[PDB]
């Protein structure tokens with residue numbers, strides 16, 4: 120049982136769950152993917168507390184339990200100013216370890232470029248610095264899928280017929296291959312997905328699905344700026360992650376001293392596929408740069 124509460128940031132209420140660590144050695148701020156999902160599917164990281172690591176979970180604007188601002192503010196740039204404000208409001212000047220998953224990773228990167236002075240380390244899992252690149256890679260993944268699912272994605276996708284059952288099949292197949300490779304997904308994940316579909320952030324900023332980025336982040340690309348990051352950076356990417364290792368490499372190539380860890384048999388939600396290993400490597404990294 121962690122403490123849950125509402126924080127008023129930039130004129131709106133943001134829900135956050137703080138799981139303090141007994142003999143806390145450091146704090147970890149987390150950023151969920153999407154955009155438009157929730158912190159829920161990241162709960163697995165809570166195990167970090169037993170390692171003396173406090174973990175801050177929170178639903179970004181318009182996500183999960185938080186309220187949406189003006190649509191004109193559905194941007195990554197705003198998401199950054201939201202993270203800082205929360206950081207500043209919840210912890211003050213105390214520096215912290217920022218972690219970002221998927222979109223949260225791209226968001227985390229944008230944050231570091233501006234407020235790395237408030238960070239001690241950066242952990243990017245399945246993240247990205249360029250949306251277009253992430254898109255071209257996924258396309259390769261699609262063409263690598265069974266003909267039926269590949270032609271169903273191109274056929275029904277070019278028409279916006281995402282409701283199509285066949286299209287749906289191709290989507291879930293893709294997910295059970297590059298999003299999460301396991302029989303039954305944990306409730307935590309299903310809720311984040313449930314949230315993305317309930318709120319309006321995922322529909323506007325991201326688009327129809329994971330491999331269909333028609334949202335307002337279509338052209339985003341700060342690969343040319345992530346180079347200014349100097350803090351201890353840890354990058355992870357599933358072997359079959361929807362955001363391919365090539366996307367993780369481009370990042371790891373711009374951040375000197377960064378580490379790249381490709382988890383075998385894992386995909387996107389590596390924190391669930393390999394909970395132990397994931398939580399381990401992340402805590403090891405942190406406990407190395409206090």
Ligand code: PRO
Pocket residue numbers: 152153154220221222223253325328329330332361362
């Ligand atoms: O977490 C997400 O939704 C981003 C955008 C699609 C690929 N990964």
Ligand code: PRO
Pocket residue numbers: 290312313315316327328329
């Ligand atoms: O139906 C889909 O594929 C989208 C993907 C995120 C959750 N719902």
